[model samples]
Target chain A: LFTGVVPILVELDGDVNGHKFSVSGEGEGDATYGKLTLKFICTTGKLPVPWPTLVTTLVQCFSRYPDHMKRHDFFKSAMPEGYVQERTIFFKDDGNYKTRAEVKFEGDTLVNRIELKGIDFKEDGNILGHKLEYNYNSHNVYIMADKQKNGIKVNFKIRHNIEDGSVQLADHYQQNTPIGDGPVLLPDNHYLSTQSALSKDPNEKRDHMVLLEFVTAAGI
Target chain B: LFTGVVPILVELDGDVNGHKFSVSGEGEGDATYGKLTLKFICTTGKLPVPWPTLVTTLVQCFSRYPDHMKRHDFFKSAMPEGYVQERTIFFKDDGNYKTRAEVKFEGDTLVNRIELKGIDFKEDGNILGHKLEYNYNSHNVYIMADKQKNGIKVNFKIRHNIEDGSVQLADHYQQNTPIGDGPVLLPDNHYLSTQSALSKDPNEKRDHMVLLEFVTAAGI
Candidate 1:
């Protein structure tokens, strides 16, 4: 068994003021027979998502999803165990965007796509204040974090299977310099130019990406 | 044998205007029998270190070293082979710090300290326009990159064996969030508060650091 750690760069569009910022963090992973697991610990700048506002946004967004009525259990118990609805998705210097994922493979036929089951934003007191679950089959999903004073909703999104006409984003796109072969730990440039993440129109663009790097070890 | 890459963050203390900036880049490494080698490709922000300014700084700084007069050969052939000293250390998007180093070990008795031999700043045309070599024994060495109009010289320095009072910098310092155990690829916070890199008094403090990370892989 082997373990490794990597840097994480998260591009966030449509903040409280409609500005974009890239939050940085790191990920740690362990590999064992037929399985690999990674746990990402991210720290965001000052961001506060009111709990009531988040719940309203979640319900509204859920209504648009197919078969929303049948997914009532998700909303009824949307607030995970030991979670409080009165609190907010607030962060200090020690905030954590808690995300964990695992992948399993046996052969080419038994490989599984990378998928994140749930991502939580924990407050300073270790409270899982906000959570966002994902559907592997869906290529895109957005979570409302906050809103402007004028009722302009602010959304945070993640996207996959990025393709533009005849081209798809490479595992590692050479921006200008020659980088290594792994998930992008830190991007020299933002994701705007490539249209893979972040755009002028936050509502229309997907501002999320994940890159992987291969591992190497030498022993006698 | 294993090969890997890590992100690079360079916190420059003084600039043409005495302003400081943090430049980002990446590093790649290969580990073979008893040896580990890393090639770092760093991209700086808009920086133009004039050739004449650099030479003048070099001569002035060299005069103060322990054996200035004995190192005449270094000055005579300071302009590396096929290098043009007339050109400035100018960088566009494709600039490279071009730093490579290797470490070897057998046991505790054969372990070698991490040291960088030389770091060159190449222009867009792949010209080794500027170079700075180092002596491992020296804890501090400064390179003159640019100059302020008022003659306030801007110096760039890399320091090792950093210690203050009774404490030494760690391989990984936790700012607030828990990061992976490797060299710091992307610093969530600058090295200011810790005084490891970047300072208000650029001349008094060292503004450079390098971190390391371990690697892992799995196989049946």
Candidate 2:
């Protein structure tokens, strides 16, 4: 009887360095088809990373979350294969300060760090070319910090493609008369899943991988 | 729990040259999204028309059925404007037979006739270039006669784009934990409809237009 478009929620969690992290987003769909976005985050400070830096590089890295998250051996209680390192240099000799930042990856771990000048690159601001502007209220400004939490978040949109196995040839060949009817409703059984993790030394005895699951079906 | 893909049936009926005719076909879909093909037939031999000729010309006409069917003034009990005329020239005085067929429309009526030499042109055959070969079964041979009935049938695939009215922001924002769920199943209330009619004189007291309805839903 659920004959309307439904709401979809995306939940994700994992570990960066030694910190446990989690975040959620939303999407739209009916029982058979729906779409939503997932935001992944990794930062140097205990707080979330800036949106600009996320967009410049981290966002690109997040898109590969599924593949990277699997690399971590959570079952073996092992570290991930690599690390993400980001560094920034600032020169404020003039009235204004000039900053340069770069990011490098050792393996394929979601764990990452970033330092902009002296800040942990946690503030939200608009970026002009290579410059970061804070005073501008323009819509063009990209948000970096988490408005609700002091945590990191990277995002991606996705939808479920459920399979329908009830289409049979005998049904279509049944009635000979012209039947006056409307669209028939099919059943739903669709789901989505992924993983997230960090690569660190296992001797630490800490788990760094998180399992991501999404669904739109009823009951289980 | 129609959680599986369901069967869809397509039914159509109309009048051509004062003849009462009807045919049915099949398709596939879940309740919300389904697809089917509709065959429209118009012939001259008091029976169905040939498929090869139908494909060469009449089939082309059927694709525009919706627009043409509306032109008939059946409520006014009047004839449809313009008519469809088909003529075929056969020169088989030699060992084999040579034939050329052409179709023309005055306005848009399903009523049509074809003459290949002295034959009413009702046999099925394969089309090689402009030649129709019945002895060869290259799969390239297109069927011209009705296999189930002596009536006409021209087909075109169609699917419904049902509207979903149930996605809201509050729904996506309600959860906190990473929910381990699958794709949500939405509701179904989709139907398909079309019309077919001839542009003939109205005073004939006979209806030449037919209504086409398709459905995949349960009950009515």
Candidate 3:
């Protein structure tokens, strides 16, 4: 008996003022007697709020779990004394959400997922409201074996809600932008350029995607 | 009317492997009106074990104060939750004991007197046997002026007894060195130098002496 490995998919759904935002991704890893940890990093800015604002709010929510769940046995067992959560945020003002989330396991293995949601916005000076919705999903997995190696893949789709009609989903963007291709490893500041090109049109419905591939040699 | 500060002295008496060892010192501070703290630095080492080897044993004695005196309402009121005692091993190779004990006032402002006695040793190298006797003889007092600026002073004297007739009194060595003055500001590495010099003379009696002194701009 070899240990079984299976692909696990996680879906997160939320809404802000009737605007629906949902994310879905899948990963595969080995489950054996030894300990295994999974990390998930998600890109931000495609949502209504900026990455810094959203992460700040989320970090506060995570910190409150310890105090709020103090009486719960599971929470107490999961989080021992002096447990802390940490996060870092990146900036992108080119109107595209360029965010990356990295999940690290025991500092030896890590998996990262980056997303760039291309969304159209109607701006009244400083206030930007969502005009159209485009969702992009990217996944990268790193496994520490004899040698650490990993691959990244991504998929993209665009959906729009009509004014007086039903919701419409199109596959044109998905057919044009195929998945499984590696992403362009641009400089840190180049993310803003990519975002600006995606937001040139307010009502233009376009699906955009990027993926990253990397590997670490043995004993690394 | 000017308030006079009384010197508080505590003596620790105990037996190690049937050999009696006594540690005595004086505390300098007022434990009244919310700011009560006392530090007892060891002066001489006579036990069979080295000085640094006694840190775990000594800290153990300090740690047991709350539980050992739980029956007394005074102790319960004076100490904070999880009160920890820390020791700085200044000079381990020295024949004289060097340690600092500090008690912070978390709730009450007054601590009359504290006596810590090492009674027994645990197999795990912890001090399992000890007696702590504290006496609070003063009424609570609050001063608007700072202790340093107001010139508040507290003094302590401690004596160690290694055996029935092997008692080392602070006064015996009191005149050999001034009550509060000796090798001022002895570093940890050189602390043993004084003790080594004392042990050089085999004919030397229990009259070996160690003294420490401090003067503040204002006394509290």
Tell me the spans in candidate 2 whose CA falls farther than 4 Å from its real position: A1-220, B1-37, B40-50, B57-79, B89-220
* Candidate 1: tens digits of C-alpha lDDT, residues B77-127: 221111111112323322323111112222311111121111233342222
User: Residue by residue across A1-220, what tens digits does model 2's lDDT show?
Assistant: 1123333333333232233444332323222221122333332223232222222222111211122232221111111222222222221221111122222222421222332233322122111122321100001101122223321122222111111211111000000110113221111221122211111222423322111111211111
Task: Provide per-model DockQ scores.
Answer: 0.01, 0.01, 0.00
Model 3 Cα lDDT, one tens digit per residue, A1-220: 1134333332334333344454443334332211111222232325443222221112000111112222221111221121122222222231333233322222222222223333332253111433222211111111111111112122222122221212323221110111223331111110000000001122323321211111111101
TM-score top scorer: 1
Docking class of 2: incorrect
Q: A1-220, model 1: which lDDT tens digit per residue?
A: 1222211222222233232233222233222111112221122443243211111111111111122222221211221111111112223322323221112222311111121111233342222332211101111112221212111111222121111111111111011111122221111111110011110111322322121121111110
Task: Give me the displacement of residue A220 in model 2, in angstroms.
Answer: 48
lDDT per residue for candidate 3 within B21-48, as digits (tens), equals 5655443332221111234344355544
Evaluated against the true chain A, what TM-score does chain A of model 1 have? Answer: 0.18
TM-score to native of every candidate shown: 0.19, 0.15, 0.18
Per-candidate local distance difference test: 0.19, 0.22, 0.23
